[PDB]
Amino acid sequence: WITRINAAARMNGLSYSRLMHGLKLSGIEVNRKMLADLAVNDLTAFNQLADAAKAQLN
Amino acid sequence: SRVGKKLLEIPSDVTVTLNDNNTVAVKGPKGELTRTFHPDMEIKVEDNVLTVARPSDQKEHRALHGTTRSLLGNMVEGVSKGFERGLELVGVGYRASKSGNKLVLNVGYSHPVEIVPEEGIEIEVPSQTKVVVKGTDKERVGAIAANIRAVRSPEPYKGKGIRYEGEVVRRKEGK
Amino acid sequence: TPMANASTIERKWLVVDAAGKTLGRLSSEVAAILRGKHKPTYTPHVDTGDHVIIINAEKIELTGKKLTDKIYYRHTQHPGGLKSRTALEMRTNYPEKMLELAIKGMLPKGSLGRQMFKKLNVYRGSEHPHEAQKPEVYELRG
Amino acid sequence: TKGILGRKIGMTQVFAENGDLIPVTVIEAAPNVVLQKKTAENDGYEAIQLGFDDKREKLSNKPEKGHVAKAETAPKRFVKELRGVEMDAYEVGQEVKVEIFSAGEIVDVTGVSKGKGFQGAIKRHGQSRGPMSHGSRYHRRPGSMGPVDPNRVFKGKLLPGRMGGEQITVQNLEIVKVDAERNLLLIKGNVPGAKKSLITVKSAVKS
RNA sequence: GAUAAGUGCUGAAAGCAUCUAAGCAUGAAGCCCCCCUCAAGAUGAGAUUUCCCAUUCCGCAAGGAAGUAAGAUCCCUGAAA
RNA sequence: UGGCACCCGGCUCAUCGCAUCCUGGGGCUUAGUCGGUCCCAAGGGUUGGGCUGUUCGCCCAUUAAAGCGGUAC
RNA sequence: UAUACGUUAAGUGGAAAAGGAUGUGGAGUUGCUUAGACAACCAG
């Protein structure tokens, strides 16, 4: 799950560590890596989550 | 004053063109040379003078710079006049040498040696105990003189051998 | 219950030039691309990589004095047989083999690693014959 | 360079002009015919092909007849390639004859040696015998088989096996006499191979 | 063809010098080629020349089966093996 | 009822290290003839006998040379 | 293949050093010291 999330995040410009820190800080959005694997199935929502994390990260 | 950090004057009768990779083609009456330097080397060359400074105080420019600027004026001389060099091969039977063109030498050592001179140099010396040579570039003329110096070899016991311009022959404990 | 992958994949074609780039700093990225770690559908037991074409492989670069000190050894299994080559000869005589060795040393061992290695094409010079596959240029992100 | 193919006939002696005696090997070589010219832009290296001996129709299949169709000739028994020769003095149908060699010219001879079958260590590699008749029970055996530490046997250790029957070359032989009416060459010395076999004569490599 | 110990010419820190740092030459029975032999199971399984061809059945297509072409083998007389 | 240190040779087959015996290339210290010394170099080569327990070993005659060692003698 | 400040150029980093060593970046001092060094170059 970590490897897949890392690849999906690097497809957006973020890295895994920065994305996880932003998610942990942009509220929490408790999301197990298993359920954040949804990058494979529906990539659009994963981009929304990454956008929120980026918005809080800066 | 570092060896090379000077203002080298020139007769202003030569041609110079510049390109990238420090490709500086210096021509004129006769010579045409091109010495390329690493790009960090700043270039400051006027019509005749070259007031090149050092980009940095570290050894890539605190020491190497003095190597470059100096030799720059060298091309001008090599472009304009030429160069000369001298030698001697003093010996009892050291008259063996070339009768023009290619070199042919019997050392008295029972093996002869044959060499053909290259382009860019002229040799005008009838008596071969002394050697006088001329050319266009100091580097090539020095190599040529090195060629003829290596032709003959000295011996310690006897006061005879091959020497540079005005030089003595090695002497050792031979008895 | 995540999703694995089984034969329902597509492999793209990428072309990377090796002009100026150092040996390892390019080989690592190329190996990572070859294993297929750059896509979210990664799978350890299935090949999901792409095809990598390298051009201008003879203009590679090495830092320091390695160009005259790095030595490639091999053994012929006979007594006293230990052949050696300096990096300069490897660069000026077999440029593609040095790149192939560097990339191959960075791939997992076993059947899948050796089958992964078959997707790499290395050419000396700036011309390749792979035209019908429509290669797409790809710069080194790292 | 230049070369030709032939068949060995045997050995004899010849008296030279000053009155001394020299051994001679007789090579019989009917004229050869070129069959193919391999070029760089089509095959990757300059070469020519030569055929030597005629064989009747029954001992020939359609591919061989088709191959020899281009240069009009009967099917040939032996076909060999020569490379390094000048490629502008040959045609597809040209004929190579023994007159190309002149008496007193150095040459090379390549051929396949005889066979001796399964042979032991002493005859195959020229090793030594153990002592006899001093309480010793060691004769003709290969010898010790390495040291103890490696826990294995090194490659290259020589052991009995099938002997002979491989290509070899003899260099710097010279020609004593040549005649074209019988297509015979007389080399000085020995030549590898059994009688009636195939031997190739080439120009000197060392020169 | 480059290289070791060495020999040099240019020229540096450092106006001088200076075979040494950027450079350029020469230099060993070692090192790669040249000589000889094996070598595409090199699964990366290469190349050129020549010969045979689009057979019959069901299955309408694919497909699968049978008899064959070029060519081999079984069997017999042997030995340069 | 002292003193104070230590804890098998021969045969048949070979292979490796260089801390080089010969051959190659050098400085040298050495008229040349030579010889001594010190660097670089492991490719190849490096002997037949008599007395003898081959010893804390003698001799004979050759060769460009009759190297030192590791591999459970 | 994060963000800042310095060191090292030899693969030191990747065992433990006597002994030897112009390798040597900084913080010091101590000299003579632009009517004046290190090359100065002309001149007992």
From Swiss-Prot, chain A:
UniProt signal peptide: none
Family named by the database record: Belongs to the bacterial ribosomal protein bL20 family.
Function: Binds directly to 23S ribosomal RNA and is necessary for the in vitro assembly process of the 50S ribosomal subunit. It is not involved in the protein synthesizing functions of that subunit.
Record's subunit section: Part of the 50S ribosomal subunit.
Protein name per UniProt: Large ribosomal subunit protein bL20
Residues of the full protein shown: 61 to 118 of 119
Curated annotation (Swiss-Prot), chain B:
Cellular-component GO terms for this entry: cytosolic large ribosomal subunit
InterPro entries xrefs: Ribosomal_uL6-like, Ribosomal_uL6-like_a/b-dom_sf, Ribosomal_uL6_a/b-dom, Ribosomal_uL6_bac-type, Ribosomal_uL6_CS
Keywords (A to Z) from UniProt: Ribonucleoprotein, Ribosomal protein, RNA-binding, rRNA-binding
A single MF term (Gene Ontology): structural constituent of ribosome
PROSITE patterns: RIBOSOMAL_L6_1
Record's keyword annotation contains Protease: no
GO BP annotation list: cytoplasmic translation
SUPFAM superfamilies: Ribosomal protein L6
Pfam families with a match to the protein in the record: Ribosomal_L6
Keyword Ribosomal protein tagged: yes
Sequence similarity: Belongs to the universal ribosomal protein uL6 family.
HAMAP family, per database record: Ribosomal_uL6_B (MF_01365_B)
Function according to Swiss-Prot or TrEMBL: This protein binds to the 23S rRNA, and is important in its secondary structure. It is located near the subunit interface in the base of the L7/L12 stalk, and near the tRNA binding site of the peptidyltransferase center.
Assembly information from the UniProt record: Part of the 50S ribosomal subunit.
The protein, known as: Large ribosomal subunit protein uL6
Originating species: Bacillus subtilis (strain 168)
Curated annotation (Swiss-Prot), chain C:
InterPro entries, per the entry: Ribosomal_uL13, Ribosomal_uL13_bac-type, Ribosomal_uL13_CS, Ribosomal_uL13_sf
UniProt-recorded Gene Ontology molecular function terms: mRNA binding; structural constituent of ribosome
Alphabetical list of CDD domains matching this protein: Ribosomal_L13
GO cellular component: cytosolic large ribosomal subunit; ribosome
Keywords, comma-separated and alphabetical: Ribonucleoprotein, Ribosomal protein
GO BP of this protein: negative regulation of translation; translation
The protein's assembly and partners: Part of the 50S ribosomal subunit. Binds to Obg (AC P20964).
Stored NCBIfam families: rplM_bact (TIGR01066)
Family: Belongs to the universal ribosomal protein uL13 family.
Function: This protein is one of the early assembly proteins of the 50S ribosomal subunit, although it is not seen to bind rRNA by itself. It is important during the early stages of 50S assembly.
Name of this chain's protein: Large ribosomal subunit protein uL13
Organism encoding this protein: Bacillus subtilis (strain 168)
From Swiss-Prot, chain D:
Keywords of the record: Ribonucleoprotein, Ribosomal protein, RNA-binding, rRNA processing, rRNA-binding
GO molecular function, one term: structural constituent of ribosome
Transmembrane segments: none
Gene Ontology cellular component list: cytosolic large ribosomal subunit
Matches recorded under Pfam families: Ribosomal_L3
Transferase among keywords: no
Stretches of the chain forming a coiled coil according to its record: none
Entry-linked Gene3D superfamilies: 3.30.160.810, Translation factors (2.40.30.10)
Domain of life: Bacteria
Biological process annotations from GO: positive regulation of rRNA processing; rRNA processing; translation
Region (Disordered): 121-151
Subunit structure, as described in the record: Part of the 50S ribosomal subunit. Forms a cluster with proteins L14 and L19. Interacts with RNA helicase CshA.
Record family assignment: Belongs to the universal ribosomal protein uL3 family.
Functional note: One of the primary rRNA binding proteins, it binds directly near the 3'-end of the 23S rRNA, where it nucleates assembly of the 50S subunit. Strongly stimulates 23S rRNA precursor processing by mini-ribonuclease 3 (MrnC); 20-30% DMSO can replace L3, suggesting the protein may alter rRNA conformation.
HAMAP family named in the record: Ribosomal_uL3_B (MF_01325_B)
Protein name: Large ribosomal subunit protein uL3
